[PDB]
Amino acid sequence: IVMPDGVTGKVPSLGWNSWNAYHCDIDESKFLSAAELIVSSGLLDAGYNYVNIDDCWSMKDGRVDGHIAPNATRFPDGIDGLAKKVHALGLKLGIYSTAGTATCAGYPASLGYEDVDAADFADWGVDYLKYDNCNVPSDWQDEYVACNPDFVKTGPNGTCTTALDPTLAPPGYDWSTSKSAERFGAMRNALAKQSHEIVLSMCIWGQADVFSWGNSTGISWRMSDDISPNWGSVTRILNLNSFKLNSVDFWGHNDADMLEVGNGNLTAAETRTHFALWAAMKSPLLIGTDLAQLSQNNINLLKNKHLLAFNQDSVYGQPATPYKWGINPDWTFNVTYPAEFWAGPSSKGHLVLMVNTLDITATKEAKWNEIPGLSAGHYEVRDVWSDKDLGCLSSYKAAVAAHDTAVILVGKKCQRW
Ligand SMILES: *[C@@H]1O[C@H](CO)[C@@H](O[C@@H]2O[C@H](CO)[C@@H](O[C@@H]3O[C@H](CO[C@H]4O[C@H](CO[C@H]5O[C@H](CO)[C@@H](O)[C@H](O)[C@@H]5O)[C@@H](O)[C@H](O[C@H]5O[C@H](CO)[C@@H](O)[C@H](O)[C@@H]5O)[C@@H]4O)[C@@H](O)[C@H](O[C@H]4O[C@H](CO)[C@@H](O)[C@H](O)[C@@H]4O)[C@@H]3O)[C@H](O)[C@H]2NC(C)=O)[C@H](O)[C@H]1NC(C)=O
Ligand SMILES: *[C@@H]1O[C@H](CO)[C@@H](O[C@@H]2O[C@H](CO)[C@@H](O[C@@H]3O[C@H](CO)[C@@H](O)[C@H](O[C@H]4O[C@H](CO)[C@@H](O)[C@H](O)[C@@H]4O)[C@@H]3O)[C@H](O)[C@H]2NC(C)=O)[C@H](O)[C@H]1NC(C)=O
Ligand SMILES: *[C@@H]1O[C@H](CO)[C@@H](O[C@@H]2O[C@H](CO)[C@@H](O)[C@H](O)[C@H]2NC(C)=O)[C@H](O)[C@H]1NC(C)=O
Ligand SMILES: *[C@@H]1O[C@H](CO)[C@@H](O[C@@H]2O[C@H](CO)[C@@H](O)[C@H](O)[C@H]2NC(C)=O)[C@H](O)[C@H]1NC(C)=O
Ligand SMILES: OC[C@H]1O[C@@H](O)[C@H](O)[C@@H](O)[C@H]1O
């Protein structure tokens, strides 16, 4: 959705969220340190300007006088006070609620209280609302389910049918009229009336066919169930998103979930693949790890100027898309072996990404005639990882480590005859 200030949320949000770092165990200091570190590590200069509180910030036992109250032990100066400290640092503050009767962690949530919660958030100086999908009451349940492989039984190729899912929405069903759309729309409407602009991030896990109506409601929408810091989830989410890229443009981006850079058992190669594809798919990019514990190597990864410029491109709204699946036939839904060959235009040139989904070194070749928007010829090519000029190339071939991604920026045409 377009926001009144004409820029906030047009390109993917960039920041840091407490969830993958701390889950439910958060307090002010964790945000103050995250913020100090975003500034001092140069991440803010790179573009990461949201410090986002996720679940577990409020007094858990209920609303206090009709309002969600900050847990004052965790936030001794309140959300408003944190907001002031964060705003002073040149950052933005995100908070979290749920379109249900309690948050996913069981805290007070916003369904039916949108106008009061939106006013509190606005009055606190909150800039971003991640809005979750837990605890939807029976009366607010959707009639149908949408074909979401993360939740519903699928046949081969991630397909849904009536026989597998009796409640699958009939063809032509308008998801904008669903209860999910209403629940989210109600918070959209509530925020819109406040003077302080808050962007809405729709944490709906790819449910309710949010791809078709999300752009009328918020600036981003989760398109899958929660990421986990392993390769299985990286490929799971990559595969799901690869089929949903047509919903991604300015003001409205599929959210491939929070970054796991720094976390779990992802190797350096997997981490690169994960960040590069998240950036290229123009998901919001929300760091999800303790920045004090993050290696300078992962910090440099996050600051990749080319991946960020591409993600943040203000002329080209579409993301990089798969042009060739690779091991499988094009358009093959496959959780372990998603589309390998990706490209999209940008102001800086064409970004090309080649994901080695195999667990052994493989040679991957970017061939210009295969890439939409390119043609046979010679282009200047730059390695995105090293920033190295690779020269004027008729194609680009690399030995790509297991689970790694070769990433190049294809520049202006060169050396003709
Ligand atoms: C496994 O399931 C998958 C997922 O459902 C399914 O995938 C489809 O596969 C078929 C081929 O079998 C694809 O059909 C081809 O489409 C080619 C170009 O399509 C582009 O446009 C597609 C249609 O766009 C419409 O719909 C969208 C939303 O519905 C809407 O936003 C648009 O406005 C428009 O109305 C579009 O779906 C597709 O998007 C997919 O692909 C891009 C990557 O290109 C990706 O980024 C997206 O995320 C999404 O996955 C894309 O935008 C078309 O050129 C091609 O034509 C070939 O054959 C014809 C013969 O007529 C030749 O003329 C031509 O030269 C080509 O050789 C063909 O029609 C279809 O697009 C896939 N759908 C999706 C959603 O991915 C597989 O079929 C399943 N496999 C099995 C075994 O069943
Ligand atoms: C979600 O909703 C938003 C808001 O309505 C909507 O945003 C719009 O996106 C389009 C498509 O990217 C924007 O229009 C483009 O703007 C860029 C940069 O200014 C231009 O380069 C584009 O022009 C090219 O393409 C045109 C035809 O497609 C050609 O006329 C021209 O020659 C260029 O090649 C293009 O105009 C538009 O500005 C925004 N709207 C706003 C208000 O910002 C978005 O598309 C929605 N998402 C989806 C999936 O529909
Ligand atoms: C607010 O947050 C504080 C601090 O995290 C919580 O304090 C804990 O309270 C439980 C029982 O109430 C104890 O078991 C813990 O030892 C306390 N921890 C600390 C460090 O004080 C408190 O529960 C939260 N209150 C609400 C209502 O959300
Ligand atoms: C996902 O794609 C992978 C790669 O094509 C498939 O894995 C292959 O499966 C066939 C059948 O078992 C084997 O002959 C190959 O040895 C496998 N290749 C690799 C590299 O593992 C897998 O079958 C696909 N999954 C689904 C559900 O279709
Ligand atoms: O409990 C908080 C969590 O709730 C889940 O529903 C969500 O997908 C996660 O991103 C995290 O927000």
Residue-number span of the structural domain to which 361 is assigned: 316-417
Of 28, 57, 185, 200, nearest to 127 (Cα)? 200
Domain ends where: 315, 348, 383? 315
211 and 260 share a domain? yes
Residue 216 dihedral angles phi and psi, to the nearest 5°: -90, 0
Binding site membership of 155 for ligand 1 (Cβ less than 6 Å): no
Of 70, 174, 73, 183, nearest to 126 (Cα)? 70
Q: How many structural domains compose the chain?
A: 2
- Ligand 4 site residues (CB inside 6 A) read 327-328, 334, 336-337
Maximum distance among all Cα pairs of the chain, rounded to whole angstroms: 77
- Residue 225: CATH number of its domain: 3.20.20.70
Q: How many residues comprise the chain? A: 417
Cα of 213 from ligand 4 centre, angstroms: 34
Taking CA atoms, 158 is separated from 170, 230, 239, in Å, by: 17, 21, 10
43 and 191 share a domain? yes
DSSP 241: H
380 and 255 share a domain? no
Cα of 172 from ligand 5 centre, angstroms: 30
Q: Using CA atoms, how far apart are residues 135 and 349, in angstroms rounded to an integer?
A: 45
Question: 303 in helix, strand or coil?
Answer: coil
> Residue 335 corresponds to which amino acid?
V
- Element (DSSP H or E) covering residue 379: strand 379-383
Cα of 250 from ligand 2 centre, angstroms: 7
118 and 58 share a domain? yes
- Residue 321: CATH number of its domain: 2.60.40.1180
Cα of 219 from ligand 5 centre, angstroms: 18
Binding site membership of 244 for ligand 1 (Cβ less than 6 Å): yes
Give the position of tokens 């043609």. 375
Binding site membership of 2 for ligand 3 (Cβ less than 6 Å): no
Q: Going by C-beta distance under 8 Å and a sequence separation of 6 or more, which residues neighbour residue 279? A: 285, 304, 307, 308, 310, 311
Taking CA atoms, 128 is separated from 122, 218, 270, 300, 382, in Å, by: 9, 11, 29, 26, 35
- Element (DSSP H or E) covering residue 397: strand 396-400
Q: Using CA atoms, how far apart are residues 313 and 149, in angstroms rounded to an integer?
A: 30
Q: Using CA atoms, how far apart are residues 274 and 72, in angstroms rounded to an integer?
A: 36
235 and 334 share a domain? no
Helices 231-242 and 268-280: angle between axes, nearest 10 degrees: 20
Q: Using CA atoms, how far apart are residues 142 and 265, in angstroms rounded to an integer?
A: 37
Q: Going by C-beta distance under 8 Å and a sequence separation of 6 or more, which residues neighbour residue 178? A: 142, 143, 144, 208
Burial group, residue 193, by CB count within 10 angstroms (0-12, 13-18, 19+): exposed
Rg (CA), the chain: 21
SS3 percent helix, strand, coil of the chain, rounded to 5, is: 30, 20, 50
Of ligand 5's listed atoms, the one at least distance from the Cα of 104 is 1
CB atoms within 10 A of CB 209: 25
159 and 249 share a domain? yes
208 and 263 share a domain? yes
- Minimal-distance CA residue to ligand 3 atom 26: 59
Helices 114-124 and 179-192: angle between axes, nearest 10 degrees: 40
Of ligand 2's listed atoms, the one at least distance from the Cα of 317 is 12
Q: Give residue 294's Cα distance to chain centre.
A: 20
Q: Concatenated DSSP letters for 130-153?
A: EEE-----GGGS-SSB---TTTS-
Of 238, 240, 180, 237, nearest to 214 (Cα)? 180
Domain ends where: 293, 315, 337? 315
Resolution (A): 2.0
Residue 138 dihedral angles phi and psi, to the nearest 5°: -55, -35
Q: Using CA atoms, how far apart are residues 78 and 58, in angstroms rounded to an integer?
A: 10
33 and 165 share a domain? yes
323 and 266 share a domain? no
308 and 213 share a domain? yes
CB atoms within 10 A of CB 301: 21
Binding site membership of 372 for ligand 1 (Cβ less than 6 Å): no
- Minimal-distance CA residue to ligand 5 atom 4: 104
259 and 327 share a domain? no
Q: Using CA atoms, how far apart are residues 400 and 238, in angstroms rounded to an integer?
A: 18
112 and 237 share a domain? yes
- Minimal-distance CA residue to ligand 3 atom 9: 73
Angle made by CA atoms 135, 140, 144, in degrees to the nearest 5: 105
Domain ends where: 315, 345, 378? 315
